[PDB]
Symmetry: D2
Subunit: 240 residues, 4 copies
């Protein structure tokens, strides 16, 4: 029995918002790889369709749905639709001067969705909520301001919610990417990329998959005592 | 008085692929659990203790659980003990590329040498031991261009307990982050795990029920729940995580 | 007198009692013209009375920081009759509470920034909430509010720095006020046990920090949250 | 007798590392506020310069030779101050041991520094304990280089200092001794002055205030921390960095 525990997710339903591209897509595939039934979502019908195509292409059971996390109606309706056709999602991954509005809107959406999925986790007496922070999204001071503020909001939010729902054996954690190989870093020249790399002790951009593996671990039974945590996944580049 | 006690299925969990792992403080509790989890994942595990009987218990446990490796005597406060043990491991087993520092300078170690007992002396001596051992294992990780160093914080024990616990945690976070920066370019990750209140032979002493009230999950953590995190940090999937301190405390945060 | 605020106009919200009152008096003591605010006309009148009683020039006003109209109107009133306030002190379901609070900081801060921008000088100082609430809910709400305030203050500081406007915060621990003075003896005794100084802080001890942050000597301090808690750190 | 907000009349203050820059500024600010100031250096010429400056600015006190790495130097200097001046109840630790800098240097520097804080702090606590009043104030090191090594070393030093200051504050609180820290960012020094026009202008871009801090701006904070008005502040690290936060 030493070599035999689940670190797998057979029998679980997972909702991953923002799953059509990059980090979200990678998360969807990693959870599927681990045996979950995955519902990935996008804000558009073509994005939802791409998700279903990808899942099937990689042999993952589940679906692609349209979801707008800013809308109570969209949230309520989508969950009803998942409950009827697939079951309650017990693993939920929120991937979906301006800094204030962005961060405030983001955190209101986490709260809206998190609240909505908690009834079913409460009823199962088990759950995993995992919040994905935003990747370093611009090179100057505005980028650092926005990135740091978003991270701080996410850390405080995640910690509070973890406290609120702990007695129900629901964990609530966050993953805080640094510079990841996605479309903002892809659009810098070789010289600027290598200069950014000089701030990163590992000397390379992170892969989407490297975010997904952490999320996969946080979703497992082995991470059951981890809650209210924000795991930084940034190759050693710390910016706050 | 022997100080070196060594010890057809293919398990899907064996991702640590014959890698050699050194886990200090492995005779008991969290350390023992870490040794077993790394073995479960297919590493060759060298667990250490400060005594020959502890080293023997480690070898006995490893064999009992089907893990290849050994139990050794190691004093992390001593340059000689460190140098010698590593040379011994290199000759007989290979270079350890996964290193887990769980062995902490006790209060009672300093006290026998007649240096002071205060938070300062404890934390300073502890962090000097992490540095000593970490430096020693870095030559072989540098040469392999791969490595994992993972530092285990101390479990929660009045105000003196809170002072010492909080100072130790802050030292560990700053230390781990700095060392991660220093060795990053070599694809060596350096991380920490910060336990909260964990079920060990020390805990079970009304106070229990009060303590649990500070823990959102309403229960003590299991040694195994620490070990799983350490195991993940050691994996290829945690390759972009470095300089991090993962708290494993059921939601109880004490600064 | 490097601590002089002679010639400056200061707006201190929530000034009719406790920490807010103490802040209003400390800034006046340092020579500012102080406009203190409350949510009611009788509160505004108490503020004017107190100021006069302590020899401080300024006024008491009614202000609801949850309302764009109240904010706009009050600033217009102050600008006409007193001048632009260049020192602003914000003293006035965890989710809804913290979110609403931080929306109010933003609303007011934005509003006063036009005049600080035009003067190319400013001080914004945000006061966190005091410890003295029951159980886990009290700790949850307190910790979330503190983290929001730290992140908010740091971001805003970054946004407005180039204009020589500093933005800082003060994070009180267990302070002697009308809200804590009659907490049950068991919670009070527990709180004291967690405090290395072994005493509750005074309102004045918060006010002195705010006063220093408002001075020219604190000009290179920005985006900081100064904890004022006798050594009790709660996260 | 007298009673004022920022007055340090009647207090004796020990400021280590006082012969130049931030330390010198701190010594003068405390003197300005009425303290008797003992400033220290590691050399006789540095001690001389301190006495000369104090007298030039009308501050009572002295300049002493002190090696904070040495128990004997620490013991002896405190004896000397106790005999001739009185017990120092305000103590400001600015004295840190400063192809010259890589990212591996952090350990030895920070370890040596924090051992010296502890040594000195312990030594001055007997007199503060007996007076049932005290101020210990630790000064962090200024951002000391432009690359990753500079950030590594600076961040490590800041973290050590935060943890240290907070723990010591907890240990000595019941005695009405406060223990705080000041964490400078980029301050106007010979390290910022050496660097070319392009590097200077780039550096300032990381600082929201768009300028280097002055030594005096650090000294004003220290002065406030030393006052009776800061009596409920303890275990705090006040960052003084114009909005540039690196950890
Ligand atoms: C928070 O650090 C401490 C608090 C109380 C006692 C000792 C320490 N720190 C300490 O001994 N080291 C070891 C020396 C370099 C260092 C660098 C970053 C963090 C910790 C440390
Ligand atoms: C940690 O902060 C929170 C905890 C619980 C709910 C909301 C928040 N944060 C929050 O409302 N804002 C306001 C929105 C911009 C923001 C930026 C940095 C830190 C906090 C916040």
């Amino acid at each position: 029995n030493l070599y035999f525990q689940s670190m797998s997710l057979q029998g679980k339903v997972a909702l991953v918002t923002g799953a059509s591209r990059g980090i979200g897509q990678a998360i969807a595939l990693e959870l599927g790889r681990l045996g979950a039934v995955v519902i990935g979502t996008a804000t558009s019908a073509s994005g939802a369709e791409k998700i279903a195509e990808t899942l099937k292409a990689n042999g993952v059971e589940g679906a692609g749905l349209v979801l707008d996390v800013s809308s109570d109606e969209s949230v309520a309706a989508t969950l009803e639709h998942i409950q009827q056709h697939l079951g309650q999602p017990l693993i939920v991954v929120n991937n979906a001067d301006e800094w204030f509005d962005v961060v405030n809107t983001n955190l209101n959406s986490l709260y809206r969705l998190s609240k909505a999925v908690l009834r079913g986790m409460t009823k199962a007496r088990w759950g995993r909520i995992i919040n994905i922070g935003s990747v370093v999204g611009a090179m100057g001071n505005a980028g650092q301001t926005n990135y740091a503020a978003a991270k701080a909001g996410l850390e405080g939010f995640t910690r509070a919610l973890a406290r609120e729902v702990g007695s129900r054996a629901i964990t609530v954690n966050a993953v805080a990417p640094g510079f990841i190989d996605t479309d903002m870093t892809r659009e810098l020249p070789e010289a600027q990329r290598e200069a950014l790399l000089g701030q990163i002790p590992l000397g390379r951009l992170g892969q989407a998959e490297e975010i997904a593996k952490v999320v996969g671990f946080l979703a497992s039974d082995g991470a059951a005592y981890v809650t209210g945590a924000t795991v930084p996944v940034n190759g050693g580049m710390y910016m706050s």
